[PDB]
Design an enzyme around this catalytic site. Structure first.
Site, PDB file in Angstrom:
ATOM      1  N   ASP C  17      24.264  40.568 -12.797  1.00 18.81           N
ATOM      2  CA  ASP C  17      24.959  41.559 -11.622  1.00 18.81           C
ATOM      3  C   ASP C  17      26.366  40.567 -11.085  1.00 18.81           C
ATOM      4  OD1 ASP C  17      23.334  39.622 -10.422  1.00 18.81           O
ATOM      5  OD2 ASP C  17      23.308  40.523  -8.436  1.00 18.81           O
ATOM      6  N   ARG C  19      27.147  41.364  -7.937  1.00 17.66           N
ATOM      7  CA  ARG C  19      27.216  41.204  -6.517  1.00 17.66           C
ATOM      8  C   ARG C  19      26.508  39.974  -6.137  1.00 17.66           C
ATOM      9  NH1 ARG C  19      24.326  45.787  -2.930  1.00 17.66           N
ATOM     10  NH2 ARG C  19      26.519  46.937  -3.261  1.00 17.66           N
ATOM     11  N   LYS C  33      28.315  34.979 -13.131  1.00 20.52           N
ATOM     12  CA  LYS C  33      27.315  34.300 -13.194  1.00 20.52           C
ATOM     13  C   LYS C  33      27.025  33.694 -14.693  1.00 20.52           C
ATOM     14  CE  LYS C  33      24.645  36.708 -10.945  1.00 20.52           C
ATOM     15  NZ  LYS C  33      25.500  37.533 -10.258  1.00 20.52           N
ATOM     16  N   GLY C  47      20.585  31.548  -8.140  1.00 19.92           N
ATOM     17  CA  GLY C  47      20.050  30.515  -6.984  1.00 19.92           C
ATOM     18  C   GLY C  47      21.367  30.049  -6.514  1.00 19.92           C
ATOM     19  N   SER C 129      16.114  37.468  -7.810  1.00 17.62           N
ATOM     20  CA  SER C 129      15.475  38.563  -7.132  1.00 17.62           C
ATOM     21  C   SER C 129      15.226  39.734  -7.770  1.00 17.62           C
ATOM     22  CB  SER C 129      16.416  38.563  -5.694  1.00 17.62           C
ATOM     23  OG  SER C 129      17.468  39.381  -6.140  1.00 17.62           O
ATOM     24  N   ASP C 166      16.182  46.677  -7.361  1.00 23.27           N
ATOM     25  CA  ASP C 166      16.286  45.814  -6.379  1.00 23.27           C
ATOM     26  C   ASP C 166      17.587  45.888  -5.543  1.00 23.27           C
ATOM     27  OD1 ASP C 166      15.990  43.529  -4.955  1.00 23.27           O
ATOM     28  OD2 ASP C 166      16.760  42.293  -6.301  1.00 23.27           O
ATOM     29  N   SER C 169      20.883  43.228  -6.125  1.00 28.47           N
ATOM     30  CA  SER C 169      22.028  43.487  -7.186  1.00 28.47           C
ATOM     31  C   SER C 169      22.676  44.652  -7.277  1.00 28.47           C
ATOM     32  CB  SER C 169      21.264  43.104  -8.608  1.00 28.47           C
ATOM     33  OG  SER C 169      20.505  41.893  -8.532  1.00 28.47           O
TER      34      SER C 169
END
Lengths: 250, 201, 220, 213, 199, 239, 233, 204, 228
Positions: C17, C19, C33, C47, C129, C166, C169
């Site tokens: 993601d 975000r 990422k 993290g 997450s 979730d 994200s």
């Protein structure tokens, strides 16, 4: 291992420093620089032993190395041997700005680098620096200042210098030129032109083989004027007309 | 625990009680809190017992060595300063030193109060110890600044007496020394039980 | 923050993601990422950023001194053991929660990096997450990878699964195609989440604000 | 967590006479209700003129005692003479203080002949503060000792009583009665009692039996 | 615990220190002086932990005494406050951190006297005044009323007389003795001591 | 070939790097100095000034404190080393124990530091010396010297350099006990030794006088110019 | 004196010349010819590798060892101490790359390496590097070609040459090569000056031509070497 | 909090051909003010500034320690400083202490030395670099910074509308909210000239 | 044929230690004397020029309150050993509450007698005369730069150590009083000095249990002079 040690650090039986006397023989050779008093400015000039024209000359300032935006130093000696001292004193000048936020004065700047060259002479048996470089700058107290470094670890600072070999005919002429300061920044540079034209080995005052960098005091920027060699040729021919005018007397 | 030191026209008067007890149990009445460093100097003991013993003795090192090298008596201001710096290195580790540096100096009488927290100060009067303020009321009301040597004896010991009267902690004997230009001299050591009827009338 | 991917026969596809949220308010709406390990190896971040960034830069710097020793082309077994080696030497004071994958001569291999240094080899791994939502698609729907393309959709199916489930994200979908000969990195892949239009013009015209002190410094 | 310091019991009473001294300590070593050993003499003789007791944590007792015995030969082989009585308590003051952060838990009482040929008692504490005293009582039973000792040896808590310094004899049974009374409520004291008498002619020891419960 | 007056004027510097060293209730040293003189144009003020004030006085006082006879001239208040910050900045993260309170006062013959602020967090600022205590609320009344910094050499001492009446209002403390100094181009000059009658 | 030892030393009875360093001392610049009840005078010459350079860079006298003055004879290379060294030494001394130790701490610092500077390996002895100038507390003068062997010693007169500077100290012994009762003649002794010492140029001569506890200042060519005129007049009064 | 930890063995001659450092130039003169040319778009390197025996295959050992993807390089003279500074430059170029985040220019490789190389010569007990490095690459859109020496002095040359008869090949590169030319024309005269001291046999393994493109350094395989030079130049 | 100790808010907004950065002039401990003339944003190089929000120590510490490594890079290579080179120069400095890191909210907004193209970035106290294509806001209250500017900032904003948009944005935030206040300095730089204006704020 | 100077030569023994003995030739001499009543020691400052100040150079220093000492050869060489030995006796009085007397000072210096070495520095050629009063009364001890401590009741150093001791060993019979040896030393003193005896030439070291300290006094130094 006592016989393999040549006793570099230890003195000579004659009272002289055995390693330093053979060190300054390289300073009399190789690098050639000059200095003189000038009002509202200071000038520096040097002649390259690399002056062979096959170089690219893409280094811009080479023998003129500029340690800080407000300060330059004309080097005489081995390049990379001096480059260890350049960034060192550059960091010494920078660490001064860190704990202070004020330009490093020229007095303690020279005594700091001369001790670094002295440390290898006093102990360690290490190869001492055969680099003798000049100093220019300005402070709010003593104003314009000129200095010189010696391989033995001493500051050779005066208001005039002879480095390192030639300029002979101009040397004694500088003592007749000892009249202190003037500007007209082009007039003091005109005096430097008769030094480079008359005392050069091939003479002719080759423009590509020499470079002139001048520091102009300005509040508070202290603008350093680095000539592009486009205005050097007209500065060369400026005093060549004056030198041709000087010979009109006799 | 009651200690007091003050300087006046003649030298410095130092007085402290000899009783050292832990809690409500009586241990030893002969404990001597006044420590002799040099013939011209006097130390004290407050808080930690061996802390005033070690550091004043470690201070005597640099003080005597300075007397061996330069052949000159060290000043009371230098001894108090050299002691504050050595203890300051151990500050925060649990050491507590309430000593009061005393002695004679080339300039004249002087007194210095040094703590484990690093306090360095001179002063006219200092009193440190266990429960006090009941003694401060009777002391400061009758205590003066510039007096003679004979009046300083009974006045300095008066504060110890009234203290031990109400306060059950302080007690034992009163060790009183008098600093002069030629160095301290032992005056007397008497038990508070015998000093009761003296200052009570 | 969610990272997931699956491995097909001739390569791997990774996604993450865009975000990145700090606190209750989204910090970086567009964030990548996926970090460069080496030409054929890519790893997904999660993290703590600055911890994993300086890590993967020191890793890649060590891998620049590692794989280049014999040259050839970077295997993952070179980077694999270094992770369990080095990350255990600190006993897990830092943190990673990363997805490691690459295409070697032995074929493609995927790994799951943990803060304590333990790494396991799996065809599908889910971290972050949204690891619960990305795993439900990879776990039950897993298949022996067959031809290339269907696995590239399996990643986008699992990546979008964690985005719509979730709430951590949001923003844009990312996909990176990693194979032996072909290497493709497409970002952003898709923008499912959009922002509502402004209710009007809130621009403040000049003249309604006074200036205490003004300064003009012309340049060259 | 692990407790490096614990109290193993024991009571030390050393009364120094005019020209000599006496050292007394119980031999019972016990932690809690169980008894390690019934005979474990705490009186340790460093030299002929000096005898030191050890109380509290037993591991630090044997350690600190054997360290001094190791430092005795260091000084004996340097100046060709044994350490003076005042030097043993003074050197211990520097040893106990150097450990101040992680100090030994010990109660020591030194007594014997000094350089003047007289008895002296040195009270010790984990911080290493000492002084020359006539008589001192350590251990956990000193609560019933110093009030009684000052009433008898110290001639306190009385009126119109002359001061006669004691020497030997009765001070013996004074250690017996305080232990039998302490043995009732406290099990850390009892069994055999090792009392050392330091005199110019040598060291004399005697064993006293006490109740085992 | 106490606040030393922070008046910074165009041509001058005014500081007023309390002479009471007393702790707890009873008084110990009445004649103590916290004022330290760094150079001819610069003063020193420190408050904090006992041993911290002693050695922080040293390091700040002595380093400027060295630069004096080194290059032949006095350090500038700008370069001095930055030098003192590094000792305070390195004290932030250290094996044994220390605590400081007060600020520095100095004078310059060109740009004029400057007043900086030393903080236990090493954070510095350029301010004509600061607040080391609760007494700032009563001082900001007359101050902010007429804020024009054109007045004056001796009027600041007369203004300090108004603050001295406002130092004791609601508090439980006494502080009868207040030592004051004044700074000009000729160096620090001594001023009279303050005494407050009890009744 | 070359056969020699270094340290230490030689069975012939004399050291090597030590007494040979004394040659690097005596060859140093000519300098003198005297002590007095109020004003102490010093001097320096043989700097070989060409008149075309700056005099402040060749200055041979620095000050650790206003009370104590530094005078050395030798190369200026190791000078700033000692200048940086000794100033930090007298600084850290200023730091703790504010009242400084009198004259026995500083004179034994450079002396003992130079002694151990010949002790440990990898340390080459300095070929320079120095003489401390200043005034002791309670109105007394203070002067000492530094030796290549590290022995501190106090002189009634400072005579080093060539043989011409040794006459300046010879003239001080001609003033006997009483002289001088005026500071005019004591400064004139340097103006008289200006002709005797070196090349007699009136340029390299420099002096500073510290009266009691007052910090000295470098002599400007007014006072010393007036005292230079009386130096020739005072010598003419003896004829 | 002191330890014996290898204090500096380098002393000064009565004229001030370096002793063992000038002797390292003899190894450069007694080495193998290496040439390079800075012209226009990029820099072109031409080295010389000839097998002393027919059993040697040049496909394994490579003379060109590029420091960075955009930075090539060659050497002259002496290997054993050459790979020491090479891998050292690989570790040293990372600080500029990690902290400043940038494909470090060749000028910074010159300043940092020659400073350590000069410090290596100042340190005794070890023989100075007998390797003369030709540093090239592309930075800020304008490439560079820099020549170092065992003493550490760094120069800048359009067309440079090292090894046996380097003064003769330098004059040929001064005449035949001038102003600036395309990389294809730069490879031409780079092989012609290499064929000067080369033997009568030139194959793909005898000469290897590296080139620094504006897109970054690309090492040409022996294939392209035999295609352009066959028929050398 | 740690960042709320000294307070402060750094708001940097990119325009069309230019870039603007703003920070409040309030310097004080907790809710007690000290002086309003303190300077937070410091000049770095030429036509480049840096915002700092956090402990005033790390504001002065980093800016001085950055000035250290600033010149040393420029003195070795005469070329400029670039916003990318100075960005990671702070990130390497903030990463010197991993578990001890300094507390600051550095915001680096400066023009490209090569072209007039502006650039904006913001870094975490631990050294994490972050970049945005619109604006970077760092301060105590994030509700007024993100709420307003998202409904205010536009893709193309000339220096006239760029300064007036953040102007009223700071007027409405200070006159309503509590923490910040006591004056706000605004640095709006372009290729031709550098403009610095100070916004009016409440004195209470 | 100089190998390491520490290397145990063909003869063989240390070079520098053999050299440091000759370093006594370049410096003045002293004369020690011991008696049951007290220990008296004499020296000569060897004044080259009147510019030398008498109290500047002293050849007798007191290490411990009751323990005197005498140096040899150079000055600053002993000064490092002198000053550091004063720290020794003081710490001994801290641990044992008693100062080192005449013995524990010797072993303290005997342990450090030779600390020198090249690897892991240069030995001093200064001889040391250790005086003091221990529990056995007044005692005088001697040591040499070679490092071996041998007890010498009355010892002379310097280049005169040969001649001065030759006549001194004969007069040390126990039947001689302290007062007879005092005037016996000045007889050898006036023979070993070229310059006439004056207040600045010589000094005396006398330590006794009853009279102290003492050390030595002023103006009593000139009384033994005019008696020459």
């Amino acid at each position: 291992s006592r016989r393999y040690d040549s006793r570099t650090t230890i003195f000579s039986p004659e009272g002289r420093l055995y390693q330093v006397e053979y060190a300054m023989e390289a300073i009399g050779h190789a690098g050639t620089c000059l200095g003189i008093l000038a009002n509202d400015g200071v000038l520096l000039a040097a002649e390259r032993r690399n002056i062979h024209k096959l170089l690219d000359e893409v280094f811009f300032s080479e023998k003129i190395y500029k340690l800080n935006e407000d300060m330059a130093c004309s080097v005489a000696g081995i390049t990379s041997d001096a480059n260890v001292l350049t960034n060192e004193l550059r960091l010494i000048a920078q660490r001064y700005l860190l704990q202070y936020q004020e330009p490093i004065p020229c007095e303690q700047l020279v005594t700091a680098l001369c001790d670094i060259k002295q440390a290898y002479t006093q102990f360690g048996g290490k190869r001492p620096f055969g680099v003798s470089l000049l100093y220019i700058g300005w402070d709010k107290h003593y104003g314009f200042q000129l200095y010189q470094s010696d391989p033995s670890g001493n500051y050779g600072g005066w208001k005039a210098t002879c480095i390192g070999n030639n300029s002979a005919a101009a040397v004694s002429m500088l003592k007749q030129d000892y009249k202190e300061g003037e500007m007209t920044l082009k007039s003091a540079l005109a005096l430097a032109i008769k030094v480079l034209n008359k005392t050069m080995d091939v003479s002719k005052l080759s423009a590509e083989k020499v470079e002139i960098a001048t520091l102009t005091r300005e509040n508070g920027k202290t603008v350093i004027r680095v000539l592009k060699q486009k205005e050097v040729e007209q500065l060369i021919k400026k005093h060549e007309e004056e030198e041709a005018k000087a010979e009109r007397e006799k | 625990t009651t200690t007091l030191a003050f300087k006046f026209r003649h030298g410095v008067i130092v007085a402290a009680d000899s009783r050292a007890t832990a809690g409500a149990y009586i241990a030893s009445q002969t404990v001597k809190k006044v420590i002799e460093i040099n013939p011209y100097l006097l130390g004290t003991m407050a808080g930690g017992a061996a802390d005033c013993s070690f550091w004043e003795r470690l201070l005597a090192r640099q003080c005597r060595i300075y007397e061996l090298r330069n052949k000159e008596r060290i000043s009371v201001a230098a001894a108090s300063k050299l002691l504050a710096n050595m203890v300051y290195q151990y500050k925060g580790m649990g050491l507590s030193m309430g000593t009061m540096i005393c002695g004679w100096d080339k300039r004249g009488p002087g007194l210095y109060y040094v703590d484990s927290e690093g306090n360095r100060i001179s002063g006219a009067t200092f009193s440190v110890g266990s429960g006090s303020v009941y003694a401060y009321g009777v002391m400061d009301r009758g205590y003066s600044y510039d007096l003679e040597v004979e009046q300083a004896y009974d006045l300095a010991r008066r504060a110890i007496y009234q203290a031990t009267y109400r306060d059950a902690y302080s007690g034992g004997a009163v060790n009183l020394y008098h600093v002069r230009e030629d160095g301290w001299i032992r005056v007397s050591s008497d038990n508070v039980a015998d000093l009761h009827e003296k200052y009570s009338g | 923050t969610t990272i997931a991917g699956v491995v097909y026969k001739d390569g791997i596809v990774l996604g993450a993601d865009t975000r990145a949220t700090e606190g209750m308010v989204v910090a970086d709406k567009n964030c990548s990422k996926i970090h460069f390990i080496s030409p054929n190896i890519y790893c997904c971040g999660a993290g703590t950023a600055a911890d994993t960034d300086m890590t993967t830069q020191l890793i890649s710097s060590n891998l620049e001194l590692h794989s280049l020793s014999t040259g050839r082309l970077p295997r993952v077994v070179t980077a694999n053991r270094m992770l369990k080696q080095m990350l255990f030497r600190y006993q897990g004071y830092i943190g990673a929660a990363l997805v490691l994958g690459g295409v070697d001569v032995t074929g493609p291999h995927l790994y799951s990096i943990y803060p304590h240094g333990s790494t396991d080899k799996l065809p599908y791994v889910t971290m972050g997450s949204g690891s619960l939502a990305a795993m439900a698609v990879f776990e039950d729907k897993f298949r022996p990878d067959m031809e290339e393309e269907e696995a590239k959709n399996l990643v986008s199916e699992a990546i979008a699964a964690g985005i719509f489930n979730d709430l951590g994200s949001g923003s844009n979908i990312d996909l990176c195609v990693i194979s032996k000969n072909k290497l493709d990195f497409l970002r952003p892949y898709t923008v499912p989440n959009k922002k509502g239009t402004r209710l009007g013009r809130y621009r403040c015209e000049k003249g309604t604000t006074a200036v205490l002190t003004e300064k003009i410094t012309p340049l060259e | 967590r692990f407790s490096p310091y614990v109290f193993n019991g024991g009571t030390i009473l050393a009364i120094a006479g005019e020209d000599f001294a006496i050292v007394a300590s119980d031999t019972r070593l016990s932690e809690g209700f169980s008894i390690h050993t019934r005979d474990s003499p705490k009186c340790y003789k460093l030299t002929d003129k000096t005898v030191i007791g050890c109380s509290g944590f037993h591991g630090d007792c044997l350690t600190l005692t054997k360290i001094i015995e190791a430092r005795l030969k260091m000084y004996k082989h340097s100046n060709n003479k044994a350490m003076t009585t005042g030097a043993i308590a003074a050197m211990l003051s520097t040893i106990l203080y150097s450990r101040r952060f992680f100090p030994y838990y010990v109660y020591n009482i030194i007594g014997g002949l000094d350089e003047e040929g007289k008895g002296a008692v040195y009270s010790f504490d984990p911080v290493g503060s000492y002084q020359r005293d006539s008589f001192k009582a350590g251990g956990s039973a000193s609560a019933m000792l110093q009030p009684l000792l000052d009433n008898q040896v110290g001639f306190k808590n009385m009126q119109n009583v002359e001061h006669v310094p004691l020497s030997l004899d009765r001070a013996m049974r004074l250690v017996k009665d305080v232990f039998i009374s302490a043995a009732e409520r406290d099990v850390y004291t009892g069994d055999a009692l090792r009392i050392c008498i330091v005199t110019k002619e040598g060291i004399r020891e005697e064993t006293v039996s006490l109740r085992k419960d | 615990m106490e606040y030393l007056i922070g008046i910074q004027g165009p041509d001058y510097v005014l500081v007023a220190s309390d002479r009471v060293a007393a702790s707890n209730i009873v008084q110990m040293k009445d004649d103590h002086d916290k004022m330290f003189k760094m150079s001819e144009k610069i003063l020193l003020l420190c408050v904090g932990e006992a041993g911290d004030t002693v050695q922080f006085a040293e390091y700040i006082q002595k380093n400027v005494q060295l630069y004096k006879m080194r290059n032949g001239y006095e350090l500038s208040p700008t370069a001095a406050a930055n030098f003192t910050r590094r000792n305070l900045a390195d004290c932030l993260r250290s094996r044994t951190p220390y605590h400081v309170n007060l600020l520095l006062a100095g004078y310059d013959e060109h740009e004029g006297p400057a007043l900086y602020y030393m903080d236990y967090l090493a954070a510095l600022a350029k301010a004509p005044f600061a607040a080391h205590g609760y007494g700032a609320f009563l001082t900001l009344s007359i101050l902010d009323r007429y804020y024009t910094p054109t007045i004056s050499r001796e009027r600041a001492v007369e203004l300090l007389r108004k603050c001295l009446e406002e130092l004791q209002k609601r508090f439980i403390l006494n502080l009868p003795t207040f030592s004051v100094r004044i700074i000009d181009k000729n160096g620090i000059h001594d001023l009279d001591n303050i005494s407050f009658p009890k009744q | 070939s070359y056969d020699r030892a270094i340290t230490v030393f030689s069975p012939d009875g004399h050291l090597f790097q030590v007494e040979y360093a004394q040659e690097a001392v005596k060859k140093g610049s000519t300098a003198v100095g005297v002590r007095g009840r109020d004003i102490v005078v010093l001097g320096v010459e043989k700097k070989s000034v060409a008149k075309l350079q700056d005099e402040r860079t060749v200055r041979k006298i620095c000050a650790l404190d206003d009370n104590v003055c530094m005078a050395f004879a030798g190369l200026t290379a190791d000078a700033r080393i000692v200048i940086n060294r000794a100033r930090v030494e007298c600084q850290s001394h200023r730091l703790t124990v504010e009242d400084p130790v009198t004259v026995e701490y500083i004179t034994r610092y450079i002396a003992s530091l130079k002694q151990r500077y010949t002790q440990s390996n990898g340390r080459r002895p300095f070929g320079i010396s120095a003489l401390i100038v200043g005034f002791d507390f309670d109105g007394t003068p203070r002067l000492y010297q530094t030796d290549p062997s590290g022995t501190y010693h106090a002189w009634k007169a400072n005579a080093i350099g060539r043989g011409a500077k040794s006459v300046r100290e010879f003239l001080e012994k001609n003033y006997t006990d009483e002289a001088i009762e005026t500071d005019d003649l004591t400064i004139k002794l340097v103006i008289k030794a200006l002709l005797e010492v070196v090349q007699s140029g009136g340029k390299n001569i420099e002096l500073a006088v510290m009266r009691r506890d007052q910090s000295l200042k470098i002599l400007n060519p007014e006072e010393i110019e007036k005292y230079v005129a009386e130096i020739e007049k005072e010598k003419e009064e003896n004829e | 004196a002191e330890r014996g930890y290898s204090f500096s063995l380098t002393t000064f001659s009565p004229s001030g010349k370096l002793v063992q450092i000038e002797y390292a130039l003899a190894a450069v003169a007694g080495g193998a010819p290496s040439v390079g040319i800075k012209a226009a778009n990029g820099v072109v390197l031409a080295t010389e590798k000839k097998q002393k025996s027919i059993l040697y295959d040049e496909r394994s050992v490579h003379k060109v060892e590029p420091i960075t993807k955009h930075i090539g390089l060659v050497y002259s003279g002496m290997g054993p101490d050459y790979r020491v500074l090479v891998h050292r430059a690989r570790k040293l170029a990372q600080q500029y790359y990690l902290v400043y985040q940038e494909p470090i220019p060749t000028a910074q490789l010159v300043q940092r390496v020659a400073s350590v190389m000069q410090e290596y010569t100042q340190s005794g007990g070890v023989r100075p590097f007998g390797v003369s490095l030709l540093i090239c690459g592309w930075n800020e859109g304008r490439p560079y070609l820099f020549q170092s020496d065992p003493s550490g002095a760094y120069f800048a040359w359009k067309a440079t040459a090292m090894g046996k008869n380097y003064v003769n090949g330098k004059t040929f590169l001064e005449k035949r090569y001038n102003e600036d030319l395309e990389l294809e024309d730069a490879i031409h005269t780079a092989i012609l000056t290499l064929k000067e001291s080369f033997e009568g046999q030139m194959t793909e393994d005898n000469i290897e031509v590296g080139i620094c493109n504006e897109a970054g350094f690309r090492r040409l395989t022996p294939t392209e070497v035999k295609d352009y030079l066959a028929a050398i130049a | 909090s740690i960042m709320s100790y000294n307070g402060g808010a750094v708001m940097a907004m990119k325009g069309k051909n230019c870039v603007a950065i703003a920070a409040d002039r309030r310097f004080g401990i907790q809710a007690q003010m000290v002086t309003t003339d303190f300077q937070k944003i410091f000049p770095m190089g030429d036509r480049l500034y840096i915002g700092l929000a956090g402990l005033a120590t790390d504001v002065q510490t980093v800016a001085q320690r950055l000035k250290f490594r600033l010149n040393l890079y420029e003195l070795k290579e005469g070329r400029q400083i670039k916003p990318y080179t100075l960005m990671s120069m702070v990130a390497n400095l903030l990463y010197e202490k991993r578990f001890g890191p300094y507390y600051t909210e550095p915001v680096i907004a400066g023009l490209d030395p090569k072209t007039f193209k502006p650039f904006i970035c913001s870094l975490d106290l631990i050294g994490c670099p972050m970049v945005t294509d619109d604006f970077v806001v760092s301060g105590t209250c994030a509700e007024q910074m993100y709420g307003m500017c998202e409904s205010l900032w536009e893709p193309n904003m000339d220096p006239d509308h760029l300064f007036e948009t953040i102007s009223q944005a700071m007027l409405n935030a200070v006159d309503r909210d509590a923490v910040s206040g006591m004056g706000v300095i605004v640095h709006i730089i372009e290729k031709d000239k550098i403009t610095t204006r100070t916004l009016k704020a409440r004195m209470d | 044929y100089d190998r390491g100077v520490n290397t145990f030569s063909p003869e063989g023994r240390l070079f520098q230690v053999e050299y440091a003995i000759e370093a006594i030739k370049l410096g003045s001499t002293a004369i020690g004397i011991q008696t049951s009543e007290g220990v008296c020691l004499a020296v000569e400052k060897r004044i080259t020029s009147p510019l030398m100040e008498p109290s500047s150079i002293e050849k007798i220093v007191e290490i411990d309150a009751h323990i005197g000492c005498a140096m040899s050869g150079l000055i600053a060489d002993a000064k490092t050993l002198i000053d550091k030995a004063r720290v020794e006796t003081q710490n001994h009085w801290f641990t044992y509450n008693e100062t080192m007397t005449v013995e524990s000072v010797t072993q303290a210096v005997s342990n450090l007698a030779l600390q020198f070495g090249e690897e892991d520095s240069r030995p001093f050629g200064v001889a040391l005369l250790f005086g003091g009063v221990d529990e056995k009364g007044p005692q005088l001890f001697h040591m040499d730069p070679s490092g071996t401590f041998v007890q010498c009741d009355a010892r002379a150093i310097g280049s005169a150590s040969e001649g001065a001791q030759s006549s001194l060993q004969e007069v040390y019979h126990k039947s001689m009083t302290l007062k007879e040896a005092i005037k016996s030393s000045l007889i050898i003193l006036k023979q070993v000095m070229e310059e006439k005896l004056n207040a600045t030439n010589i000094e005396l070291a006398t330590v006794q249990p009853g009279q102290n300290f003492h050390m030595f006094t002023k103006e009593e130094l000139e009384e033994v002079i005019k008696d020459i």
